[PDB]
């Protein structure tokens, strides 16, 4: 929520969508700076995350708009 | 981190008024959220490592950054000697 | 013609002037009752001057620089005492005997390190 008066990005990430958004049927993209907020032009693909024990795939189906990319990464065994 | 970064502060430390803090004095005032012009800000944030204010600082009488007391002008280990030549005028027998 | 004092007690900061005849108590532009209207000490300021028949003889005018009503009740004690202290040298024995000369100065040798009581040295009946 501290994204305090409007949107931002990962600056290096969207710079690098640019061939894997060229006919979205393709293999995934990857990111390590999990803070990672993202444009609605990504809709149609797979984007995986450094959790960071391993690298877990998150999925840009039909709705993406509302939270940073951390919301599905399992960082250590939650007892 | 002992000496580290000094060179890269030095390389832009004197021109922050030229990366923003005078460059701003007409174009960037219409770019406020007080004055509304929404296409203008997105071209002046580009300067990244020299966006004012950001300063690694220099502990000087100490050779490596073991803090910096920004009230007194010396490292978080030095203090003892102030009491022994004049630098902290308030340092008598502690109140504790 | 006139006689005077000032005080320092919990935490004020008050003056007082004795004046010729009519017997009243005037704090800046108002009466005693307006300033301590519930404040249970109030008698103690007019008490030692009602002995010496004030009503046709003295008049009392006051002003104050940080109120402090619970402590003022002794700043005024000391002050009004300095005023009578040149009115009539006779009553220094009355002011003392009635406690009206005393002013806050004492702690009863209290704690510095841990012990409660801290001036008195080791005592025995032959060690």
């Amino acid at each position: 929520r501290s994204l305090k008066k409007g949107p931002f990005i990962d600056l290096h990430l969207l710079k690098k969508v640019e061939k894997a958004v060229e006919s979205g049927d393709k293999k995934p993209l990857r990111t390590w700076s999990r803070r990672s907020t993202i444009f609605p032009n990504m809709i149609g693909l797979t984007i995986a995350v450094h959790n960071g024990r391993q690298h877990v795939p998150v999925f840009v189906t039909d709705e993406m708009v509302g939270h940073k990319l951390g919301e599905f990464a399992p960082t250590r065994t939650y007892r | 981190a002992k000496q580290s970064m000094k060179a890269r502060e030095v390389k832009r430390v004197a021109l922050a008024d030229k990366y923003f803090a005078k460059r701003a004095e007409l174009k960037a005032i219409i770019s406020d959220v007080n004055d509304r012009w929404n296409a203008v800000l997105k071209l002046q944030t580009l300067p990244r490592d020299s966006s004012p204010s950001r300063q690694r600082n220099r502990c000087r009488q100490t050779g490596r950054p073991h803090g910096f007391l920004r009230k007194f002008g010396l490292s978080r280990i030095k203090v003892r000697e102030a009491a022994m030549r004049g630098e902290i005028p308030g340092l008598k027998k502690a109140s504790w | 013609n006139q006689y005077y004092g000032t005080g320092r007690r919990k935490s004020s900061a008050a003056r007082v002037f004795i004046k010729p005849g009519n017997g009243k108590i005037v704090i800046n532009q108002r009466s005693l009752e307006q300033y301590f209207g519930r404040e249970t000490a109030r008698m103690v300021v007019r008490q030692p001057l009602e002995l010496v028949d004030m009503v046709e003889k003295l008049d009392l005018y006051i002003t104050v620089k940080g109120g402090g009503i619970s402590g003022q009740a002794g700043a005024i004690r000391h002050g009004i005492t300095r005023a009578l202290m040149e009115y009539d040298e006779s009553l220094r024995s009355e002011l003392r005997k009635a406690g009206f000369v005393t002013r806050d100065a004492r702690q009863v040798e209290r704690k510095k390190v841990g012990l409660r009581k801290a001036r008195r040295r080791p005592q025995f009946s032959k060690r």
């Binding site: - | - | 519930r38 404040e39 249970t40 008698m43 619970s70 009863v108 009581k117 008195r120 005592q123």
Partner: protein, 150 residues
């Protein structure tokens, strides 16, 4: 501890010039704030006189007779176990220690207001019915009795 300095001097009540009515309130205070506690004690003494229509502050005594003890129990393990021997309280103590049992009865008493928790228990205390008087009579049942075991 060789020097005589062992008790507070305090000043008299604002009306009847009595350190009696003054030590009452200054026992009742438990949280500080004096001058409004002193006006509420002054409200106790008027609610008192609603019973009788005269100087019931003279009957303050005729209750305080029953709350004053002669004896108190303090640290005396002398004889290889608890060996009490209370000793009497010096004359100056008889009625301050009675204020101590009037204020512990008032704390949870239950009466409408706190002016009435004190003015009712004084009324009872003259009746010997009282909860301040019951605590004293307990000590008399206890240590004034144990005179015969000392």
């Amino acid at each position: 501890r060789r020097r005589v300095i062992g008790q507070r001097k305090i000043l008299p009540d604002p009306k009847f010039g009595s350190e009696l009515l003054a030590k009452f309130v200054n026992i009742l205070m438990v949280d500080g704030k004096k001058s409004t506690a002193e006006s509420i004690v002054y409200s106790a003494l008027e609610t008192l006189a609603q019973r009788s229509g005269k100087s019931e502050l003279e009957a303050f005594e005729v209750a305080l007779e029953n709350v004053r003890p002669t004896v108190e129990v303090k640290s005396r393990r002398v004889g290889g176990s608890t060996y009490q021997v209370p000793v009497e309280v010096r004359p100056v103590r008889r009625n301050a220690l009675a204020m101590r049992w009037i204020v512990e009865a008032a704390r949870k008493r239950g009466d409408k207001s706190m002016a009435l928790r004190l003015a009712n228990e004084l009324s009872d205390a003259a009746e010997n019915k009282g909860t301040a008087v019951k605590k004293r009579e307990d000590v008399h049942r206890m240590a004034e009795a144990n005179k015969a075991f000392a």
